[PDB]
Write a protein that binds this ligand. Structure first.
Ligand code: HEM
Ligand SMILES: CC1(C)[C@@H]2CC[C@@]1(C)C(=O)C2
Ligand SMILES: [K+]
Length: 405
């Protein structure tokens, strides 16, 4: 249902897009969001769905807003408003200047040098999973690879038992694509319930896992509090359990449907890093936003203090004003413009981990299973939310065409 239009919002800018269930979802989630960029549609629209909020539809406005933290605060970054208000993860719920000391701590646990440390175990895991699947001639890609591969890497980094995944994965999903059984506040409270005793424990007896590092850490040279450590560790869990997991399934679905693209990467595997970046553009998948700190005129539209504005990271690279023929995947694309990992001071801290996981996946999969397709008859369904994903991805191949390494 539709929230009554506020007096300040002009009627001609109303476009009732539902970020948790977009109209055109059956055509693909990126396609469904791209309807906001059809010729009829202003650069900035108001939807009455999900309590009512602005949506910037073009990369120019999305970038500008993400740069301007004085007008567009990350204190309430999720729609609906109750989710945004409850949202308190660190660093994302904080604006500069105080945000920054916390980013620096987070970088000690997910930064380039840590990923270099993880490199061999990331490869080993990719390979053990793929080799196991290779002979079977089929898989449920979401559950058999996309989920276990990035998630087990995160649980290893965090020093958490793998048997805790189904519970944590359920909770993180309720924050990004809720099935209605939990509010965001409830899911958050449960993630923190899980974390609290582990944080206390690791402050007492420090290990070398990510939770210990964060929990015993300093920010601008003063000790982090247990509450700060919990708000940072929660976010890290979310990043680990619901980002790359979804992205891998979009990419593999595309490769399953497009032999010429796989052929290109089999014939020339040096192109894989560039292909990674182009898939990160075409199959971009995050959309969160900001809250207005004051009344502010933006691109000829009056915004009011407290208005929420969705700034979909997904849309920038799909914008035909950033990338010609945006829905086409071109591994040779000369200037791959996107905001897939965000923009401004909250630029994704996990992006180095994410690119390593994706590139290792592409290399190792195509090396063993170069020819595969979607199970015949399977109608692939996407799902939309703060992070979008794929419900299920049944794949099939002829074992005879595979190669053990
Ligand atoms: C394909 C994978 C990924 C995508 C597309 C993605 C995207 C994003 C986006 C758009 C933001 C900015 C949100 C905002 O401005 O409100 C962000 C921030 C963040 N990301 Fe990622 N991310 C991914 C992977 C990961 C991973 C694997 C981790 C951790 C293991 C992670 C950790 C974080 C953290 C801690 C921040 C907050 C930075 C801040 O608020 O200063 N990311 N990411
Ligand atoms: C929007 C995000 C992808 C980014 C990292 C996890 C996530 C859901 C957040 O709350 C911040
Ligand atoms: K908040």
């Amino acid at each position: 249902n539709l929230a009554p239009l506020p007096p300040h919002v002009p009627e001609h800018l109303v476009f009732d897009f539902d970020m948790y269930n977009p109209s055109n979802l059956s055509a693909g989630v990126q396609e469904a969001w791209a309807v906001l960029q059809e010729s009829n549609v202003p650069d900035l629209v108001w939807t009455r769905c999900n309590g009512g909020h602005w949506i910037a539809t073009r990369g120019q406005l999305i970038r500008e807003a993400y740069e301007d933290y004085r007008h567009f605060s990350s204190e309430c970054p999720f729609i609906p408003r109750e989710a945004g208000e409850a949202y308190d993860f660190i660093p994302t719920s904080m604006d500069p200047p105080e945000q920054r000391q916390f980013r620096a701590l987070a970088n000690q646990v997910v930064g380039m040098p840590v990923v270099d440390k993880l490199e061999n175990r990331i490869q080993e895991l990719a390979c053990s999973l793929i080799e196991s699947l290779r002979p079977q001639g089929q898989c449920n890609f979401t559950e058999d690879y996309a989920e276990p591969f990035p998630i087990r890497i995160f649980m290893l980094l965090a020093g958490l038992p793998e048997e805790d995944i189904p519970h944590l994965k359920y909770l993180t999903d309720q924050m990004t694509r809720p099935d209605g059984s939990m509010t965001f506040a409830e899911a958050k409270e449960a993630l923190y319930d899980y974390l609290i005793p582990i944080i206390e424990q690791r402050r007492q007896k420090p290990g070398t896992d990510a939770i210990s590092i964060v929990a015993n850490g300093q920010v601008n040279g003063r000790p982090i509090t247990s509450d700060e450590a919990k708000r940072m560790c929660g976010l890290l869990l979310v990043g680990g359990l619901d980002t790359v997991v979804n992205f891998l399934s979009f990419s593999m679905e595309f490769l399953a449907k497009s032999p010429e693209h796989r052929q290109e990467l089999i014939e020339r595997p040096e192109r894989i890093p560039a292909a990674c970046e182009e898939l990160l553009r075409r199959f971009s998948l995050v959309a969160d936003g900001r809250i207005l700190t004051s009344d502010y005129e933006f691109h000829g539209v009056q915004l009011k203090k407290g208005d929420q504005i969705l700034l979909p990271q997904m849309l920038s690279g799909l914008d035909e004003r950033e990338n010609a023929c945006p829905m086409h995947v071109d591994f040779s694309r000369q200037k791959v413009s996107h905001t897939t990992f965000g923009h401004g001071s909250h630029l994704c801290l996990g992006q180095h981990l994410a690119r390593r996981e994706i590139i290792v996946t592409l290399k190792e999969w195509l090396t063993r299973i170069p020819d595969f397709s979607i199970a015949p008859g399977a109608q692939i369904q996407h799902k939309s939310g703060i992070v979008s994903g794929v419900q299920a991805l049944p794949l099939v191949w002829d074992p005879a065409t595979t190669k053990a390494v």
